[PDB]
Amino acid sequence: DSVTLRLMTEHDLAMLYEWLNRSHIVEWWGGEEARPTLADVQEQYLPSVLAQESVTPYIAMLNGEPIGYAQSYVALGSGDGWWEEETDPGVRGIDLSLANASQLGKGLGTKLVRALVELLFNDPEVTKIQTDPSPSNLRAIRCYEKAGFERQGTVTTPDGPAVYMVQTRQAFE
Amino acid sequence: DSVTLRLMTEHDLAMLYEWLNRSHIVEWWGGEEARPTLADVQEQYLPSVLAQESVTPYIAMLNGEPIGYAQSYVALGSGDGWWEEETDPGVRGIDLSLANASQLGKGLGTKLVRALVELLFNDPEVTKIQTDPSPSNLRAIRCYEKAGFERQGTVTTPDGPAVYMVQTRQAFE
């Protein structure tokens, strides 16, 4: 049980494309529809395109095996209505939504979160990590808390209410 | 005649490597030194690595042929002491130092500048483009002025004084 992260590179885009075609669920209410093409993936996840939005892509690995995709982003200046009240350039948010996109039968839980937190605090410009799980996602909230995150309350995002959680460098230590 | 820019991808790293061992000048005051390997270049300019620093890499093209490399960056929050007085997330900096690195002949002047500015302003989050040429570089400064930038004065950077120049979305229109 060794969970670790690396930068995602373009060679990973084929793999991500494969994983998104595993994770593809059309719910009865039917957003989604499409189902991504290799070109769709390249277009959305190209590292250079993510760079324009201050997003950094990662591959989460279990025992050297890539099992999912993660992203960190600079909260401040995110746009499309995201994190509009942010003031501090050092806040990084994390997006673990694709962190089991390979559909392993078990999630890397707080181990995954700790490794991402540790990696991000390696950059001296980073002051605090935030994450915004669904208010109904009690298990993810608990995993974040076990990893050192503290619930701050519920915020309205473009995707709806979210439970806003943070870990400062100081708290992390 | 027709200058365009596209996002740089990993495929371009070899070409960039070649351009760099091509426009390679060692100055009497010694620096630059080591001389770049493919590995140095692929490591330093890997788009995912640039993403971690909120830097977007571009390949400048003339009539569909690659002639040089350009980067833009989010000024706010850059660190290593860069742009510490910035407060606006919408500010993007440009770095044209390698924009004629193919050294295939005559340089794209204002045309290049305008195309990079246009591309950045296509992002609604971008409020202002900045550039920081050497104060002795009177010709670069003139090209930036022809392209719509306005001198704001001289600022101290980690690399010494630079002439601070900007073009607001308003001014560009």
XYZ file of N, CA, C and O in Angstrom, chain B residues 47-146:
400
model
N 5.470 20.917 -20.599
C 4.288 21.705 -20.258
C 3.669 21.463 -18.864
O 3.216 22.419 -18.239
N 3.640 20.218 -18.371
C 3.080 19.965 -17.024
C 3.898 20.666 -15.938
O 3.328 21.102 -14.918
N 5.220 20.738 -16.123
C 6.071 21.465 -15.166
C 5.751 22.966 -15.226
O 5.595 23.611 -14.211
N 5.621 23.509 -16.432
C 5.229 24.912 -16.577
C 3.864 25.172 -15.953
O 3.634 26.222 -15.360
N 2.947 24.210 -16.073
C 1.624 24.356 -15.443
C 1.696 24.606 -13.939
O 0.949 25.440 -13.407
N 2.606 23.907 -13.254
C 2.807 24.110 -11.824
C 3.220 25.519 -11.478
O 3.093 25.913 -10.340
N 3.778 26.244 -12.457
C 4.231 27.614 -12.254
C 3.307 28.615 -12.945
O 3.635 29.799 -13.053
N 2.140 28.132 -13.394
C 1.122 28.970 -14.060
C 1.679 29.678 -15.316
O 1.337 30.819 -15.590
N 2.533 28.961 -16.053
C 3.147 29.417 -17.285
C 2.594 28.544 -18.444
O 2.582 27.294 -18.374
N 2.112 29.226 -19.487
C 1.617 28.585 -20.703
C 2.656 28.784 -21.793
O 3.031 29.940 -22.059
N 3.138 27.671 -22.408
C 4.092 27.724 -23.507
C 3.397 27.702 -24.880
O 2.394 27.016 -25.044
N 3.898 28.518 -25.813
C 3.358 28.663 -27.197
C 4.479 28.484 -28.212
O 5.640 28.686 -27.912
N 4.094 28.064 -29.403
C 4.984 28.019 -30.528
C 4.438 29.090 -31.454
O 3.259 29.045 -31.812
N 5.270 30.072 -31.788
C 4.893 31.117 -32.743
C 5.141 30.590 -34.144
O 6.143 29.890 -34.391
N 4.200 30.883 -35.030
C 4.241 30.397 -36.393
C 4.100 31.549 -37.392
O 3.358 32.515 -37.148
N 4.842 31.427 -38.491
C 4.698 32.285 -39.672
C 4.221 31.466 -40.858
O 4.893 30.547 -41.294
N 3.019 31.772 -41.332
C 2.387 31.001 -42.404
C 2.427 29.499 -42.136
O 2.762 28.706 -43.018
N 2.110 29.118 -40.903
C 2.032 27.699 -40.516
C 3.350 26.996 -40.224
O 3.364 25.772 -39.945
N 4.450 27.736 -40.294
C 5.768 27.210 -39.988
C 6.173 27.749 -38.627
O 6.021 28.932 -38.391
N 6.701 26.887 -37.742
C 7.172 27.291 -36.385
C 8.454 28.107 -36.446
O 9.433 27.671 -37.029
N 8.458 29.287 -35.848
C 9.674 30.101 -35.915
C 10.256 30.391 -34.543
O 11.419 30.763 -34.409
N 9.436 30.216 -33.505
C 9.915 30.547 -32.176
C 9.010 30.091 -31.055
O 7.932 29.497 -31.288
N 9.473 30.374 -29.847
C 8.774 29.971 -28.632
C 8.397 31.213 -27.845
O 9.184 32.188 -27.762
N 7.196 31.178 -27.259
C 6.714 32.293 -26.423
C 6.053 31.698 -25.166
O 5.634 30.543 -25.198
N 6.045 32.437 -24.054
C 5.307 31.994 -22.839
C 4.468 33.144 -22.388
O 4.876 34.309 -22.546
N 3.339 32.830 -21.767
C 2.610 33.807 -20.983
C 2.532 33.266 -19.558
O 2.780 32.097 -19.321
N 2.219 34.129 -18.607
C 2.223 33.704 -17.209
C 1.264 34.585 -16.447
O 1.000 35.740 -16.841
N 0.725 34.033 -15.377
C -0.048 34.806 -14.432
C 0.915 35.585 -13.571
O 1.755 34.994 -12.897
N 0.802 36.912 -13.549
C 1.834 37.698 -12.855
C 1.671 37.511 -11.352
O 2.659 37.301 -10.618
N 0.424 37.613 -10.902
C 0.132 37.566 -9.453
C 0.517 36.203 -8.912
O 0.152 35.164 -9.514
N 1.277 36.194 -7.825
C 1.631 34.945 -7.156
C 2.809 34.175 -7.760
O 3.032 33.041 -7.409
N 3.586 34.798 -8.634
C 4.695 34.088 -9.310
C 5.809 33.606 -8.391
O 6.463 32.586 -8.654
N 6.093 34.343 -7.330
C 7.203 33.862 -6.447
C 8.632 33.924 -7.034
O 8.835 34.464 -8.124
N 9.626 33.368 -6.309
C 11.054 33.660 -6.552
C 11.233 35.205 -6.604
O 12.144 35.731 -7.245
N 10.337 35.923 -5.934
C 10.362 37.386 -5.898
C 9.771 38.149 -7.066
O 9.897 39.364 -7.136
N 9.129 37.448 -7.998
C 8.606 38.069 -9.210
C 7.228 38.667 -8.993
O 6.349 37.993 -8.459
N 7.030 39.918 -9.430
C 5.703 40.588 -9.418
C 5.048 40.634 -8.025
O 3.855 40.474 -7.888
N 5.858 40.864 -6.996
C 5.351 40.867 -5.610
C 4.319 41.964 -5.281
O 3.608 41.879 -4.266
N 4.246 42.991 -6.121
C 3.362 44.127 -5.859
C 2.049 43.939 -6.599
O 1.163 44.770 -6.474
N 1.949 42.895 -7.423
C 0.745 42.685 -8.189
C -0.409 42.354 -7.214
O -0.174 41.739 -6.192
N -1.634 42.764 -7.551
C -2.814 42.377 -6.774
C -3.942 41.807 -7.636
O -4.866 41.192 -7.097
N -3.865 42.003 -8.960
C -4.929 41.571 -9.887
C -4.627 40.213 -10.559
O -3.663 40.108 -11.353
N -5.460 39.168 -10.271
C -5.320 37.872 -10.961
C -5.468 37.839 -12.456
O -4.944 36.896 -13.075
N -6.140 38.844 -13.023
C -6.377 38.958 -14.458
C -5.160 39.424 -15.275
O -5.202 39.494 -16.500
N -4.088 39.783 -14.595
C -2.865 40.228 -15.280
C -2.072 39.030 -15.769
O -1.788 38.075 -15.010
N -1.791 39.068 -17.053
C -0.902 38.092 -17.715
C 0.336 38.793 -18.217
O 0.227 39.829 -18.829
N 1.485 38.190 -17.963
C 2.752 38.601 -18.511
C 3.103 37.809 -19.771
O 2.643 36.698 -19.966
N 3.899 38.419 -20.644
C 4.417 37.726 -21.820
C 5.921 37.713 -21.846
O 6.596 38.611 -21.334
N 6.457 36.628 -22.377
C 7.887 36.499 -22.475
C 8.212 36.082 -23.902
O 8.050 34.919 -24.272
N 8.681 37.047 -24.689
C 9.025 36.839 -26.081
C 10.523 36.575 -26.324
O 10.953 36.561 -27.459
N 11.306 36.316 -25.275
C 12.753 36.192 -25.453
C 13.174 35.152 -26.493
O 14.160 35.369 -27.214
N 12.391 34.071 -26.621
C 12.720 32.995 -27.553
C 11.847 32.977 -28.799
O 11.782 31.962 -29.521
N 11.155 34.091 -29.054
C 10.176 34.133 -30.137
C 10.793 34.094 -31.551
O 10.074 33.926 -32.514
N 12.110 34.215 -31.677
C 12.746 34.038 -32.989
C 13.818 33.004 -32.869
O 14.791 33.070 -33.588
N 13.652 32.039 -31.953
C 14.735 31.118 -31.645
C 15.113 30.219 -32.835
O 16.215 29.693 -32.848
N 14.226 30.086 -33.832
C 14.580 29.346 -35.031
C 15.665 30.078 -35.822
O 16.292 29.461 -36.672
N 15.846 31.380 -35.557
C 16.829 32.218 -36.254
C 16.794 31.961 -37.748
O 17.843 31.840 -38.361
N 15.594 31.833 -38.321
C 15.458 31.466 -39.739
C 15.551 32.705 -40.607
O 15.458 32.629 -41.862
N 15.742 33.847 -39.939
C 15.902 35.118 -40.632
C 15.296 36.273 -39.860
O 15.594 36.470 -38.670
N 14.432 37.020 -40.543
C 13.861 38.247 -40.013
C 12.810 37.932 -38.939
O 12.003 37.009 -39.104
N 12.848 38.695 -37.845
C 11.924 38.499 -36.719
C 10.515 39.055 -36.863
O 10.287 40.145 -37.426
N 9.556 38.310 -36.328
C 8.198 38.805 -36.240
C 8.193 39.911 -35.171
O 8.416 39.637 -33.999
N 7.993 41.159 -35.565
C 7.953 42.243 -34.594
C 6.563 42.384 -33.989
O 6.054 41.460 -33.319
N 5.944 43.535 -34.248
C 4.622 43.873 -33.718
C 3.566 42.853 -34.059
O 2.662 42.617 -33.282
N 3.666 42.239 -35.231
C 2.693 41.242 -35.626
C 2.587 40.143 -34.570
O 1.495 39.756 -34.175
N 3.744 39.652 -34.139
C 3.864 38.661 -33.099
C 3.249 39.143 -31.799
O 2.482 38.423 -31.170
N 3.585 40.365 -31.401
C 3.059 40.920 -30.153
C 1.525 40.940 -30.203
O 0.844 40.416 -29.300
N 0.990 41.550 -31.256
C -0.454 41.652 -31.421
C -1.171 40.319 -31.376
O -2.226 40.211 -30.775
N -0.608 39.308 -32.028
C -1.240 37.979 -32.040
C -1.259 37.333 -30.642
O -2.243 36.661 -30.270
N -0.187 37.528 -29.874
C -0.152 37.033 -28.488
C -1.143 37.772 -27.586
O -1.854 37.139 -26.809
N -1.207 39.099 -27.710
C -2.178 39.915 -26.966
C -3.619 39.501 -27.320
O -4.446 39.285 -26.445
N -3.921 39.398 -28.609
C -5.243 38.963 -29.045
C -5.607 37.613 -28.429
O -6.716 37.438 -27.928
N -4.670 36.670 -28.460
C -4.922 35.319 -27.956
C -5.237 35.366 -26.459
O -6.149 34.680 -25.999
N -4.510 36.206 -25.715
C -4.701 36.287 -24.257
C -6.027 36.942 -23.911
O -6.750 36.464 -23.029
N -6.363 38.021 -24.625
C -7.635 38.686 -24.383
C -8.869 37.858 -24.771
O -9.985 38.178 -24.354
N -8.679 36.785 -25.518
C -9.783 35.867 -25.811
C -10.298 35.148 -24.580
O -11.415 34.644 -24.572
N -9.462 35.112 -23.546
C -9.810 34.607 -22.239
C -10.436 35.780 -21.455
O -9.790 36.832 -21.272
N -11.711 35.615 -21.002
C -12.420 36.729 -20.385
C -11.857 37.053 -19.033
O -12.071 38.142 -18.546
N -11.126 36.118 -18.434
C -10.492 36.413 -17.146
C -9.287 37.362 -17.275
O -8.800 37.848 -16.278
N -8.784 37.595 -18.485
C -7.533 38.424 -18.631
C -7.884 39.893 -18.726
O -8.631 40.307 -19.620
N -7.337 40.669 -17.800
C -7.667 42.072 -17.643
C -6.603 43.019 -18.300
O -6.935 44.121 -18.810
N -5.334 42.579 -18.292
C -4.190 43.422 -18.667
C -3.003 42.544 -19.022
O -2.806 41.494 -18.410
N -2.239 42.923 -20.051
C -1.033 42.145 -20.413
C 0.119 43.020 -19.963
O 0.048 44.225 -20.118
N 1.151 42.430 -19.355
C 2.324 43.187 -18.986
C 3.540 42.641 -19.723
O 3.580 41.459 -20.113
N 4.558 43.486 -19.895
C 5.874 42.973 -20.408
C 7.013 43.769 -19.749
O 6.784 44.919 -19.329
N 8.190 43.172 -19.562
C 9.255 43.853 -18.828
C 10.596 43.801 -19.553
O 11.530 43.154 -19.048
N 10.712 44.495 -20.713
C 11.987 44.520 -21.403
C 13.071 45.274 -20.683
O 12.799 46.081 -19.764
N 14.318 44.968 -21.056
C 15.474 45.683 -20.476
C 15.367 47.174 -20.762
O 14.990 47.573 -21.852
N 15.705 48.024 -19.786
C 15.609 49.448 -20.102
C 16.493 49.893 -21.310
O 16.134 50.854 -21.989
N 17.600 49.200 -21.559
C 18.504 49.518 -22.700
C 17.948 48.997 -24.005
O 18.468 49.307 -25.077
N 16.908 48.161 -23.940
C 16.403 47.582 -25.183
C 15.365 48.470 -25.870
O 14.160 48.196 -25.853
N 15.856 49.516 -26.533
C 14.989 50.606 -26.957
C 14.092 50.149 -28.086
O 12.937 50.540 -28.165
N 14.622 49.279 -28.928
C 13.867 48.713 -30.034
C 12.718 47.783 -29.633
O 11.659 47.842 -30.240
N 12.939 46.942 -28.631
C 11.868 46.039 -28.146
C 10.749 46.897 -27.603
O 9.576 46.656 -27.886
N 11.143 47.918 -26.839
C 10.229 48.837 -26.174
C 9.399 49.514 -27.249
O 8.180 49.601 -27.121
N 10.059 49.957 -28.332
C 9.350 50.601 -29.435
C 8.321 49.645 -30.088
O 7.203 50.043 -30.330
N 8.727 48.410 -30.423
C 7.796 47.387 -30.909
C 6.583 47.158 -29.991
O 5.475 47.043 -30.459
N 6.820 47.067 -28.690
C 5.721 46.944 -27.737
C 4.784 48.132 -27.767
O 3.564 47.946 -27.659
N 5.360 49.332 -27.889
C 4.571 50.549 -28.044
C 3.789 50.529 -29.368
O 2.600 50.848 -29.388
N 4.427 50.115 -30.468
C 3.695 50.049 -31.727
C 2.503 49.065 -31.619
O 1.443 49.237 -32.260
